[PDB]
């Protein structure tokens, strides 16, 4: 189908308590496959999905080498920003960074993105053209200045156009049996008494992959998703996902209903009734 390789960095200041934490994680689509904590003894970047491990030891050293610089570079960035804003060095503040690429069905390469937030608010971002920067406030414009004088967008563009899409390609071959196989949800619908007068009527879909899914609830043929409570999809632990959608209904009227689960691995969408 379509796929994406992304990396997610986080830097948190712990005032008085030594260095800031720098976590880093890698994703191919919805499956995590790499991590790095700066709270780790002799800390290296450990695999987190099985299909990655047969990459040469050169890789892993070259990455924890890069991860260690990013933690260093960021802990200074925390400092730089805190003074752009004149906040107290006792405050806890967080700097987040994200980058990656989306490639199409043939490997088209659809979008490259690279974005940075400070304390959860947009800070500066690479634009869709991979050559300009959106800068949120007057502090981020100083960063934008620095990064325009160094050709920073050009380094990133060639990372996101080449290294990204190439290594993505490599990753999905390695995990061909894991990542390229969708997993149809287990459907089922339970019924939970509330009273003499009405009853919760849950629609479950368990164990699916990837995470995207739609559940829909149809009264008498209507589309009654207006009243339904849908929790947000949640990880199952085994690397698959779950979500459910309930309704509340006059007694007897359970047979009035339908739940409909649409999902990439369902050959044709399934509908079910009590």
């Amino acid at each position: 189908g379509s796929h994406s390789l992304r990396y997610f960095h986080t830097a948190m200041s712990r005032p008085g308590l030594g260095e800031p934490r720098f976590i880093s994680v890698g994703y191919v689509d919805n499956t995590q496959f790499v991590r790095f904590d700066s709270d780790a003894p002799n800390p290296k970047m450990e695999p987190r999905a099985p299909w990655v491990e047969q990459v040469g030891p050169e890789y892993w050293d070259e990455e924890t080498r890069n991860a260690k610089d990013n933690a260093q570079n960021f802990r200074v960035n925390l400092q730089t920003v805190l003074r752009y804003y004149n906040q107290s060095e006792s405050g806890s503040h967080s700097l987040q960074r994200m980058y990656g690429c989306d490639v199409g069905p043939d490997g088209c390469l659809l979008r490259g993105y690279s974005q940075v937030s400070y304390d959860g608010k947009d800070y500066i971002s690479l634009n869709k053209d991979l050559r300009s920067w959106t800068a949120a406030d007057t502090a981020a414009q100083i960063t934008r200045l620095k990064w325009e004088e160094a050709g920073v967008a050009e380094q990133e563009r060639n990372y996101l156009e080449g290294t990204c899409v190439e290594w993505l390609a490599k990753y999905l071959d390695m995990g061909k049996e894991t990542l390229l196989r969708a997993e149809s949800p287990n459907t089922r619908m339970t019924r939970h008494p509330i009273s003499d007068r009405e009853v919760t009527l849950r629609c479950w879909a368990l164990g699916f992959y990837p995470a995207e899914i739609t559940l829909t609830w149809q009264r008498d043929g209507q589309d009654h998703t207006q009243d339904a409570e849908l929790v947000e999809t949640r990880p199952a632990g085994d690397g698959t996902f779950q979500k459910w959608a309930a309704v509340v209904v006059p007694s007897g009227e359970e047979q009035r209903y339908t739940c409909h689960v649409q999902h990439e691995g369902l050959p044709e969408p399934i509908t079910l009734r009590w």
Partner: peptide, 9 residues
């Protein structure tokens, strides 16, 4: 693979 970035603010 990660992006090698001497990226300071």
């Amino acid at each position: 693979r990660s992006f090698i970035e001497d990226l300071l603010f």
